[PDB]
């Protein structure tokens, strides 16, 4: 038996949903708080077990409340998520690979007991918006040990990613003018290793800022992503893949399916 996997077994509608299925609590982390970040908040679950722990980082310009309904989504399929806010919003991509760096190490070490002890502290994984994308990059290509990178329509003027071998979906948007995927997003998937798990899931009729916007697809491949590789929890593997390879909602996906089941 996997002893990580949580919750039940998951089906499309569930992952759909406006919620998953456990209740959620939060803890504010206040700037004071916050050493190397800008504070931001730790969504968990209400029911006690360990989960793995995911640190997200909002963009350019943004706030903690630019990603503060995918922090509560995600904790809401079994783990603990901190949104952040940056030191300032016009912190660059690898400044804010080291605050998300910071605010794991928060979450694990520094947070109140209840968030402490609902940690699992060698499953991590990292998530951002748009320049937290770009951190999401460059942490992942710092911290192999990392169990799974998702950066949300990616902006990084670094293309080269050959160095990551942590778990990578990354989602453009097609009408990104801002980190065009042309430019962002679609190079930084082709330069990840083909050796390793990873995938490139594009939105249809999506903006830059979809991922700011609560989004059922978003919702539902960031937590199978995170589930399959955070949790190893292969209940997940069937929603991957083959995956989306969806007029309206999908216009591609690529991967190396089937991640050595």
Same mark, same amino acid.
């Given at each position: 038996?996997? @002893?990580?996997? =949580?919750?039940?077994?998951?089906?499309?509608?569930?992952?759909?949903?406006?919620?998953?299925?456990?209740?959620?609590?939060?803890?504010?982390?206040?700037?004071?708080?916050?050493?190397?970040?800008?504070?931001?908040?730790?969504?968990?679950? =209400?029911?006690?077990?360990?989960?793995?722990?995911?640190?997200?980082?909002?963009?350019?310009?943004?706030?903690?409340?630019?990603?503060? !309904?995918?922090?509560?989504?995600?904790?809401?399929?079994?783990?603990?998520?901190?949104?952040?806010?940056?030191?300032?919003?016009?912190?660059?991509?690898?400044? =804010?690979?080291?605050?998300?760096?910071?605010?794991?190490?928060?979450?694990?070490?520094? &947070?109140?007991?209840?968030?402490?002890?609902?940690?699992?502290?060698?499953?991590?994984?990292?998530?951002?918006?748009?320049?937290?994308?770009?951190?999401?990059?460059?942490?992942?290509?710092?911290?192999?040990?990392?169990?799974?990178?998702?950066?949300?329509? @990616?902006?990084?003027?670094?293309?080269?990613?050959?160095?990551?071998?942590?778990?990578?979906?990354?989602?453009?948007?097609?009408?990104?003018?801002?980190?065009?995927? &042309?430019?962002?997003?679609?190079?930084?998937?082709?330069?990840?290793?083909?050796?390793?798990?990873?995938?490139?899931?594009?939105?249809?009729?999506?903006?830059?800022?979809?991922?700011?916007?609560?989004?059922?697809?978003?919702?539902?491949?960031?937590? &199978? !992503?995170?589930?399959?590789?955070?949790?190893?929890?292969?209940?997940?593997?069937?929603?991957?893949?083959?995956?989306?390879?969806?007029?309206?909602?999908?216009?591609?996906?690529?991967?190396?399916?089937?991640?050595?089941?």
């Amino acid at each position: 038996a996997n @002893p990580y996997e =949580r919750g039940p077994n998951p089906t499309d509608a569930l992952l759909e949903a406006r919620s998953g299925p456990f209740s959620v609590s939060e803890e504010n982390v206040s700037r004071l708080s916050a050493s190397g970040f800008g504070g931001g908040t730790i969504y968990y679950p =209400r029911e006690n077990n360990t989960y793995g722990a995911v640190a997200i980082s909002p963009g350019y310009t943004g706030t903690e409340a630019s990603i503060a !309904w995918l922090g509560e989504r995600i904790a809401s399929h079994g783990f603990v998520v901190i949104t952040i806010d940056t030191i300032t919003t016009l912190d660059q991509p690898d400044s =804010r690979a080291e605050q998300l760096n910071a605010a794991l190490n928060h979450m694990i070490n520094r &947070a109140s007991s209840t968030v402490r002890s609902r940690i699992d502290s060698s499953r991590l994984a990292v998530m951002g918006h748009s320049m937290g994308g770009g951190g999401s990059l460059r942490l992942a290509s710092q911290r192999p040990d990392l169990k799974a990178a998702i950066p949300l329509t @990616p902006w990084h003027l670094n293309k080269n990613w050959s160095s990551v071998t942590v778990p990578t979906l990354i989602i453009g948007a097609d009408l990104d003018t801002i980190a065009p995927v &042309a430019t962002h997003a679609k190079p930084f998937y082709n330069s990840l290793p083909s050796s390793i798990s990873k995938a490139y899931l594009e939105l249809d009729g999506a903006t830059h800022f979809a991922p700011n916007i609560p989004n059922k697809i978003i919702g539902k491949y960031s937590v &199978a !992503w995170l589930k399959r590789f955070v949790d190893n929890d292969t209940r997940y593997t069937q929603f991957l893949c083959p995956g989306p390879r969806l007029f309206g909602e999908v216009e591609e996906y690529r991967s190396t399916c089937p991640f050595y089941p």
